[PDB]
Ligand SMILES: O=C1CC(=O)NC(=O)N1
Ligand code: NA
């Protein structure tokens with residue numbers, strides 16, 4: 001629980017140091033969530049998964065994907081942006097759109113399932129700008145305190161002595177672009193892959209191949225995007 005336990009227990013060691021400026025804020029978010037349950041409102045994903053993106057090593061990140069907030073349907077959000085458990089079917093519509101673009105850009109077949117853990121295990125941070133949502137109500141936790149947390153995460157990645165490519169999907173993710181100005185960092189941005197915005201420029205955006213051409217240009221290893 002993020003109210004009760006310190007960052008050294010909740011997240012990977014690198015991340016716990018990266019997030020030290022927002023340690024109090026993370027504990028405040030735990031109190032927010034406790035107050036939501038006390039009031040009779042729910043949240044997603046499960047408490048133990050809220051900070052899951054920060055359980056993969058900070059030092060290993062090469063690409064950041066940033067979306068808006070977690071899936072609104074109970075059983076979808078797992079604490080990694082856009083990912084679902086490997087037994088979820090049908091896929092959420094945003095994920096089906098992502099995979100559409102993944103096949104169009106990379107030429108790979110459609111993935112077997114919606115589990116994006118291989119990307120997280122290969123240096124892709126699967127972040128959302130806001131880390132919780134009320135069921136059925138997208139953007140319901142906007143402006144409740146998560147933005148400081150994910151701003152801190154980006155600033156800290158950007159400051160590392162390492163290349164970084166950010167893929168910013170949608171309007172709320174785009175508000176991280178000012179914190180990527182330094183020469184070691186580059187941001188791709190597009191409309192969000194949700195059906196409400198995908199046709200405004202998500203489809204055709206080629207984010208996966210472009211991120212790899214940016215990494216290679218900076219002297220970093222490209223991501224192996226291929227899902228099973
Ligand atoms: O519905 C969703 C899921 C997610 O993780 N990220 C988003 O921006 N939208
Ligand atoms: Na949106």
Ligand code: NA
Nearest residue numbers: 068170171172
């Ligand atoms: Na957004």
